[PDB]
């Protein structure tokens, strides 16, 4: 796995911000495209662009096999069973809300809990809140360790036999915690509930096998994992999917249509209503495949590196705190004593620098963390502990900076 | 308006299937991209790809100005008059699917109407009939005249001071007619009705000004109009946007979350949850522009011109039944006694030409037509009347082959 030729790819990393060198370190906010997906993108308009699922003409029938094709490639990717498990969404956020609307508003009675933990994303706190509150049901909280992990001692205290729905992300896209989702898995179903992976920051990182997790749903997004804007996947296990009705309602998810009544496509096609996300999921393939190519443990063993030697170099730096555990995902969340994390994210622009600073739309982690923002560097395949020294460096420089002032 | 120079932006056209050249007359199913809109994503994807609505650093904010700034093209685009109004989605179907749930499921009760019509695209119908089911109240239907327009009259007849809701397409996909928009919002408003307006095959071919038409909720879609797959906008009045709920939750969409309730955006972010479709919304700001440039008055008048050739010159086929009216927008559907329209269609595409056959999605307009399926040729501003003249001899071709078989 060579760094150098895995940059060259990238052609945004190429460029100079405020006169110096881009430093890409915000990843977990979205990640860059190699340019195999941007020219899969190009050669799609250029070449074969036509609408999917006719087949009467050349370039339909191409179009067609290209997006029914990635489906196949997202399939073999999380090596589900079935294409039929396999459902293109606009982005981990629609598609932890189809569960809500179709599963969840259908399966909740007062008296039935949700369980989720307080680490969780807003993708993944939101949509509960408003299925239970539709339903009567009642929303629980696992809570956390003091090093921000969940332990499964807590888990098996919080999920009860009225517990219907556990809903937990794999990796954290603050702490850096990735939750042992499979045995949270094993206290669901021993409990009689389903539970729903938020994988958003997982799947670009580390490789899935949703067979050996046992989740019943998992739910990803193409952008952060060197994919397009605007696509992502709802993975469910094909009976629980058989016998939840569509989230949404047109032409390509009917079978039959009356005045009155309709009856709906077999899977995955019932969940994909009206013209599909064609180009965006011919590029997620694409990235598929470059990912593949390097291969996910490659990558999860060079952020693994890149993560153990930030927390070092952070740990040289005096006045400075990181939240969560060692053992972690490729990021490190972060505030400067005595620096508000958005003035620290702005003098980290002018040198180049690209952070976060803000909530990381995990407000009750935040609170949790008694802190109103923090600022978070996040890595990928293409960045260096090179560009890390100089992320270190800068916060020595911010904070000597805002002494002296 | 030179149609050799339109067609040099437009890679896709300049190639051949079966060995002949391509004659694409399928953009009423989904329309070609000029390198104006590709090299749009290109330049984003290679230059200033990032998340957006943070701006604390550099790519950030000007991904940030490239999406809301496509935001400002669309509500000029279809004067709207505020960007509150204007809200992106992944197309049309999820548009009026945004319009059911959060507008008629809340508004609707026993005894209420929802109005449509017997031509309307399976978009503008299933919603429909699940929110009425929902909700116990009533569907109709607007009949249509014998050449498949609507009239005033049967408006006025069926929407009563029970409806609450009337919609209908802009222009009809199969029949080509272009509705009476504007007359029927005001016969909605004078009973107490909302009106949504399915714009998918309007807004490409033609000027819309919604302040002109005074529509309640209107709905497009990009790909149809030279822009990026996987987007489309929804507009709705920002009182009526104002007073509705989000139809999805999450990040982005929210002002405060605590461990059980959330409070919202402002408009029009409370309708976009999660990280948005920045590529392909920055390219349907691209597309509007190049559009723009060319003029819609202009492109109306290439497809008049187009239409009213091949209404000629199909009259001079025997044994072809054309449906809809004489004024209409620029496509033809159709069929060859005793052809069944699958094979037209398989047989066309031998000859290099890309046409549609089957329900169209219309499959309530197909059975009042009294066909079980049929053929439609589209027309959009890269065709000619050259490429009219090859379909008309191809069908006449075809005539006799079946003829002799």
């Known amino acids: 796995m ?4 895995i940059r060259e790819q990238f052609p945004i990393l190429h460029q100079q911000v405020n006169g110096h060198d881009l430093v890409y370190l915000d990843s977990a906010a979205t990640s860059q495209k190699p340019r195999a997906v941007i020219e899969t993108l190009d050669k ?16 339909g029938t191409r179009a067609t096999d290209g997006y029914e094709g990635a489906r196949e490639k997202v399939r073999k990717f999380i090596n589900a069973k079935s294409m039929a ?16 609307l ?10 039935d809990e949700v369980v989720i933990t307080y680490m969780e994303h807003h993708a993944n706190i939101i949509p509960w809140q408003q299925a239970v509150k539709a339903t009567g049901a009642t929303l629980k909280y696992i809570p956390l360790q003091e090093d921000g992990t969940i332990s499964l001692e807590d888990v098996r205290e919080t999920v009860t036999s009225n517990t219907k729905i556990v809903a937990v992300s794999h990796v954290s896209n603050v702490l850096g915690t990735v939750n042992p989702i499979k045995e949270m898995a094993k206290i669901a179903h021993d409990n009689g ?42 993975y469910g296990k094909k009976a629980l999917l058989e016998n939840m009705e569509p989230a949404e309602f047109g032409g390509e998810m009917i079978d039959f249509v009356g005045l009155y009544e309709s009856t709906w496509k077999e899977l995955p096609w019932k969940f994909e209503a009206g013209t599909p996300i064609i180009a965006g999921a011919i590029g997620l393939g694409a990235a598929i495949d470059f990912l593949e190519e390097i291969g996910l443990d490659e990558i999860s063993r060079h952020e693994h590196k890149l993560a153990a030697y930030a927390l070092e170099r952070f740990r040289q730096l005096d006045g400075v705190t990181v939240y969560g555990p060692e053992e972690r995902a490729g990021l490190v969340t972060f505030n400067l004593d005595d620096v508000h994390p958005h003035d620290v994210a702005t003098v980290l622009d002018a040198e180049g620098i690209a952070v976060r ?34 992320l270190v ?3 020595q420089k911010t904070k000597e900076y805002f002494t002296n002032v």
């Open 2 to 5: 060579n760094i150098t030729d």
């Open 44 to 59: 799609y308009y250029n070449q074969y662009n036509s609408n999917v699922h006719r087949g009467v003409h050349t370039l």
């Open 85 to 100: 498990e396999i459902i293109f969404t606009k982005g981990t956020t629609t598609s932890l809300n189809m569960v809500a």
């Open 102 to 111: 179709s599963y969840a508003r259908a399966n909740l009675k007062p008296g």
């Open 193 to 234: 509930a389903v539970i729903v992976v938020d994988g958003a920051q997982s799947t670009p990182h580390m490789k899935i096998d949703v067979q050996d997790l046992d989740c019943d749903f998992f739910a990803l997004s193409s952008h952060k994992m060197c994919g397009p804007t605007g696509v992502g996947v709802l």
């Open 357 to 390: 600073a803000g909530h990381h739309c995990a407000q009750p982690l935040m609170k949790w963390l008694d802190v109103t923002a923090t600022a978070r560097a996040s890595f990928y395949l293409y960045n260096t502990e090179e560009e890390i020294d100089k």
């Open 393 to 395: 460096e800068a916060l």
